[PDB]
Design a protein around this nucleic acid. Structure first.
Ligand code: VHT
Ligand code: VHT
Ligand code: MG
Ligand code: MG
Ligand code: MG
Ligand code: MG
Ligand code: MG
Ligand code: MG
Ligand code: ZN
Ligand code: ZN
Lengths: 367, 182, 367, 182
DNA sequence: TGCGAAATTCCATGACA
DNA sequence: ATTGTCATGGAATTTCGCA
DNA sequence: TGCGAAATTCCATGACA
DNA sequence: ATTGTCATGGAATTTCGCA
């Protein structure tokens, strides 16, 4: 009222351009703008107007302004619109993001065999000999894979299988997702007794176990081919598939996982015989050079509209299993620490510290 | 002549019958000739079926060119011969009553029999669970001749479980009394 | 034998380079190559060798050759490898494609309202007033949307809802996916009685109904926002959501669906009043110009490794619901006709003619 | 003064009671004043509840500025007044016993009553299913004054169902005999 | 004839089972 | 016999208010 | 010192619930 | 407190066989 009063008599007010005529009509301050005559509401009514227009269909910036512009005008309207969008809890937790995650990391290949195992379960598969699942264990450095059929993705089945595997060697680190078989206290005690450090993917991010996931693809692809035109009796094929994949060349590496593990082929078809005249010591010397000269990929280019996390930034975690007609995002949380450009610790929506992947985060819009 | 290599020759033999441990009575011993690396498989009988079942696990990891054994019935059966022929494995038998292997394999099989005896006393029915730690000990044992453990010769790296404290491998006076009682 | 015989005595044979020495040893023809001594098998044995090497793990071109190269050499080995890859039925139907589909078409917006309806079902939703599904009807030209709650995605529920809708106007064409409610003979008879042509998406390709699918997203997004912190009673919100979306501005169009349909806002909040001084005839004249000047997107750039179908080409249709450990692709079929760069008729794996999207096809590898 | 426009004024009235047709006895008639476009809603009673339920369907498509009706109890109730007030709809009533609308709306409501009568005979209990085709006929009827159909004035296009063959709209001699018998 | 800022346009991102 | 679509919010671009 | 062709390398595509 | 991966087959590039 007071601000609009001096505008009616001709005094200049910052934000209101002077070249327009501000008159009164029907008890309302109006202005003749190129798009037409618009009502200038007092400052004390603009928040309610923005809220009424936005709440019609919970529209974004432009779709909300187009509604308001049909009747009203005032300085810096979109500023007030964005101010309401950032305060509408329903939009913040339901809307999608339009900013992609930063480019993926390509973490270093483990230096030695048995430095880091990646493990995961496949299944449920069609029942074969009473078995439904396959425990998959891939050595990070070599890609050498062990297959164990199980009746359940349970801790007890994991421990039994790994007790057999660890008869050959004990790994430094075992990496796995946060499935129930690997997060139980029983499995943690099993690893501590053997000096094995357990490493866990961020939740709901199978990329982090990509080493084994990618092997799972090859396992099921070969099983599918061998089972064409036959009933899905896969139990007896696991040893075949294990041996077949462990002696398959990687075209970019020029070596098989067996070769990276032992430095010499065993009595398998088409065995390589290049080191036949070398001694075992000379063979192992060549093997050490091969392990260190393997091709390693680099981080891809960031997309044109990616975001990277910053300490103190407001971010929102993706809802794990969102119910029907329920929001896909949690309420905003704060980035406590940036472990790497793709991994952060947030002050969780429950109050806890949570280590998550930025693939399961979006930056809260409108700051 | 070509230098000796892993997977050139696997030496196999049965140890048993042992006290029952979770239904198993025998141990199939497999030793790689070049490295001395040892695999142990518990079986319920020294039969061809039990041998084929255990070696199918091992031969899904690595296949030897030659398998060596004595004239035991499980190893001289026509079924086991067909099994080896299907996998391109040549079977090599020692003369009856004249077991012949190598100094390294002889001493390795000696260590296995002695290490099992030292751990059988006090818990003769719990050796099935101890088979993993037994192989780790055997395969991370320093070789005086080659100056490398079987683990080092097979994988070309050091191990994450180096066994520095050697068991006496000789039964203590109290362990001898408990073994005579059993 | 005969070809390899003249090679042993020093005569030149095409394909075998002359600068190498071809000798005999252990009853086998061999050659000293830079990588080592390799066996030269006779022509009559090379197919079996390629097959044995490939069948170890059903590997591709390079991974199969690396096996063969460990022992053998002969002229143009990869040519024989590719010849076997193109004949291995298990690989052709199990392997993935590495050629992307051609760029999407952006079909013309229908010229007039009621020229083409797009219809589809949403659900099952949480039970609200005994209802589980929502029939969605979007006019192609305007985007104006009608919402009907149903207890099942059935033909009877579709006919009842469309009989009410068609009280206002009859559309020329109704487009829908191949769901059961829209493909029944009862629904076909219903449309023929009213002069309505039924148009169907290619199977398993919701992109083709993208007009309604995109509206389904907005419908569920607004329902989610309105139901935050409340039980999911969505039945009474359908009329609200319908009105709210029909009067929401599209920022790229600068108009609401209601405006594109009627040319004037009704008594809704923030109604536009720009044509208040025009007559209805002048209003409808401006509306006709607006309908013809709407922004239309164009075909995006093709990706660097895309494929486009050609008449007579061997292609494979994606398996609809592939069972566990079963191939993801059907046996090769032939392209009969190219309706557009993204749609073809194939001689189906059952012998029938099938109109499919190239998104559900891959080109058969190795010709 | 501003030219007349669609949605400026909706004229509403009840027709009935009619013979029962799938449980419905009345028809709520809604006519847009400017275009003459007609919406028909079957109800079971001329009550406020039935009126609000039917107009909630229509007002989810378009909201009028003014609703006009006579002094019927369904329209003058405090509940219906609150319903209109919640939607920003002004209610406008004609003087009791003096129904007033417009020439176009008067003639349109005349056509509706006559078209329903012509189709009631022979099948007086099957008018619920015929309501869609009745509205299409009414809304695609050429207007002598405006020289455009309601469909054309409301959507600004031609229709896909142009009604060129007009029903006689006068009962044939045989239709009159069957109506007198009923 | 040019400046700083507001307003408009652009468009990558993601979801419709 | 058929075919993706478009709300969203930071960024890039254009226009505006003034001189 | 250069040519045609074979061989090797490159790398976008897609799937691991 | 953690992090994508790699077989695949046309295409692009390099090497080979010969002169
Ligand atoms: C995105 O999917 C998820 O949120 C997690 N799903 C699992 C997946 C999963 O979704 N795998 C698919 C998949 C998607 C993207 C990738 F980059 C890798 C994958 F394996 C999984 O492979 N395993 O082993 C799981 N194990 C336990 C619990 C969940 C999963
Ligand atoms: C790829 O998913 C399919 O094969 C088809 N699924 C359906 C989908 C579906 O998968 N929708 C998701 C979806 C994915 C990609 C798109 F470009 C649009 C979509 F709606 C659907 O929306 N409707 O309505 C269906 N109706 C009947 C039968 C199937 C669907
Ligand atoms: Mg998992
Ligand atoms: Mg997995
Ligand atoms: Mg023996
Ligand atoms: Mg559908
Ligand atoms: Mg759909
Ligand atoms: Mg009345
Ligand atoms: Zn909102
Ligand atoms: Zn194959």
């Amino acid at each position: 009222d007071a601000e609009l009063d001096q505008l009616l008599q001709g005094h200049y007010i910052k934000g209101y351009p002077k070249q327009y005529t501000y008159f009164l009509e029907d008890g309302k301050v109006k202005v003749s703008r190129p798009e037409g005559v618009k009502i200038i509401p007092p400052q004390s009514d603009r928040q309610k107007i923005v809220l009424q227009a936005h709440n019609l269909a919970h529209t974004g910036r432009e779709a909300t302004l187009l509604k308001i512009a049909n009747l009203y005008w005032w300085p810096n309207m979109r500023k007030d619109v964005v101010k309401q969008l950032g305060r509408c809890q329903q939009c913040l937790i339901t809307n999608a993001s339009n900013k992609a995650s930063g480019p993926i990391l390509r973490p270093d290949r483990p230096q030695k065999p048995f430095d880091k195992f990646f493990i995961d379960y496949i299944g449920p598969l069609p029942p074969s000999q009473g078995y439904l699942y396959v425990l998959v264990v891939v050595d990070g450095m070599t890609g050498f894979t062990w297959l164990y059929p199980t009746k359940a993705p349970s801790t007890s089945a994991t421990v039994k299988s790994l007790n057999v595997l660890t008869s050959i060697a004990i790994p430094k680190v075992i990496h796995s997702d946060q499935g129930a078989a690997f997060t139980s206290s029983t499995f943690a005690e099993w690893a501590k007794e053997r000096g094995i450090h357990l490493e866990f993917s961020t939740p709901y991010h199978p990329q982090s176990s990509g080493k084994v996931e990618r092997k799972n693809s090859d396992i099921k692809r070969l099983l599918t081919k061998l089972l064409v035109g036959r009933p899905t009796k896969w139990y007896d094929l696991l040893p075949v598939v294990q041996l077949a994949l462990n002696n398959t060349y990687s075209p970019v590496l020029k070596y098989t996982p067996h070769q990276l593990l032992f430095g010499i082929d065993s009595n398998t078809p088409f065995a390589n015989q290049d080191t036949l005249d070398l001694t075992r010591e000379e063979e192992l010397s060549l093997l050490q050079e091969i392990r260190t000269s393997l091709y390693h990929p680099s981080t891809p280019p960031a997309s044109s509209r990616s975001w990277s996390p910053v300490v103190g930034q407001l971010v929102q975690e993706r809802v794990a299993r969102p119910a029907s007609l329920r929001p896909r995002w949690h309420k905003p949380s704060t980035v406590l620490k940036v472990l790497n450009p793709r991994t952060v610790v947030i002050l969780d929506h429950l109050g806890n510290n949570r280590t998550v992947s930025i693939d399961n985060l979006k930056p809260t819009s409108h700051q | 002549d070509r230098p000796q290599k892993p997977f050139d020759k696997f030496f196999i033999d049965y140890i048993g019958p042992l006290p029952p441990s979770q239904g198993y009575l025998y141990v199939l011993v497999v030793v790689d000739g070049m490295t001395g690396f040892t695999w142990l498989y518990p079986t319920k009988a020294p039969s061809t079926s039990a041998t084929v079942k255990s070696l199918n696990v091992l031969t899904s990891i690595a296949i030897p060119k030659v398998i060596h054994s004595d004239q035991g019935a499980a190893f001289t059966s026509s079924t086991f011969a067909e099994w080896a022929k299907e996998r391109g494995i040549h079977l090599e038998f020692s003369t009856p009553y004249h077991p012949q292997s190598s100094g390294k394999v002889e001493r390795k099989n000696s260590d296995i029999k002695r290490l099992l005896t030292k751990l059988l006393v006090g818990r003769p029915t719990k050796w099935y669970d101890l088979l993993p730690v037994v192989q780790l000990a055997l395969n991370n044992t320093y070789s005086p001749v080659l100056k490398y453990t079987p683990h080092q010769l097979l994988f070309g790296i050091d191990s994450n479980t180096p066994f520095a404290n050697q068991d006496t491998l000789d039964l203590t006076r109290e362990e001898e009394l408990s073994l005579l009682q059993e």
